[model samples]
Target: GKLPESPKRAEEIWQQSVIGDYLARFKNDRVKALKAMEMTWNNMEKKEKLMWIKKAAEDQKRYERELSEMRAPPAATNSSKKLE
Candidate 1:
């Protein structure tokens, strides 16, 4: 129930997964990077104008569970299910 803010036009707040995908071509093009970020941020089907994601207890549990799994010795994996 609050306004989403970019770094430039924003008062500092919490952080989220701000960027998802990026394409490179202009050679260290931070302008493009910021452009891409702003574009993606602006152009969502459901416009996230005033949005704040509520943290859930399960989020921590899930993260801890995943962290523990990552710490555990990876089970011997049989690689398959890929096209030749």
Candidate 2:
């Protein structure tokens, strides 16, 4: 008797952990992004504040796209086997 091996399955499991960590960091980044915007608004001159606001808007949009993509369905699981 022998067991089959799948490199793709192994890789997927490894990547799952990585993806989870990335999502967690993404959440934190959103919080920091908001704080940065607030600080920039409170401390910067009009011109600088406008620049910071633009950067903050870009960051927010990027975060939203990433979050939405993460929620999308994962690839189909492979199911190939031989029995005797």
Candidate 3:
């Protein structure tokens, strides 16, 4: 797939990875869903699994970067700290 590229596309794909991979499944039954997905994943050959692993890592890093950007700086800077 010669996917035509854009940061938005990458971001969307990254979103799909995190939001689909485990997190979405983790909602209803927790470990049961996890075990099921895991069982399914067990059938994947190493190369295929590695593709997912790489996607997972990519999504994880992108999340961390985006989090740092939007994260609250500090609730109690010196001025706020002294407020009564």
Report every candidate's CA lDDT: 0.35, 0.41, 0.45
| Candidate 2 lDDT, 18-79, residue by residue in tens | 44554467765645544544464457666655554445454444554344433422211211
- Summarize candidate 3's per-residue lDDT along 11-84 as a digit string, tens digits: 24434444455556556453554554455555666644555666655555555444443331211222222223
Q: Single out the weakest 10-residue window by summed lDDT for candidate 2.
A: 75-84
lDDT of model 2, residue 65 = 39
Superposition-based RMSD of candidate 1 using all C-alpha atoms, in angstroms: 14.3
Q: Indicate whether candidate 1 or candidate 3 has the larger TM-score.
A: 3
Maximum-lDDT candidate:
3
Deviation in angstroms for 32 in model 1?
A: 1.3
TM-score of 1: 0.27
Candidate 1: tens digits of C-alpha lDDT, residues 1-84: 112212322111112233222334555555665666556546753344323122323234444434444342231121111111
**Model 3, 63: alpha-carbon shift in Å?**
4.1
Ranked candidates, highest TM-score first: 3, 2, 1
Question: Of 1 and 3, which scores higher on lDDT?
Answer: 3
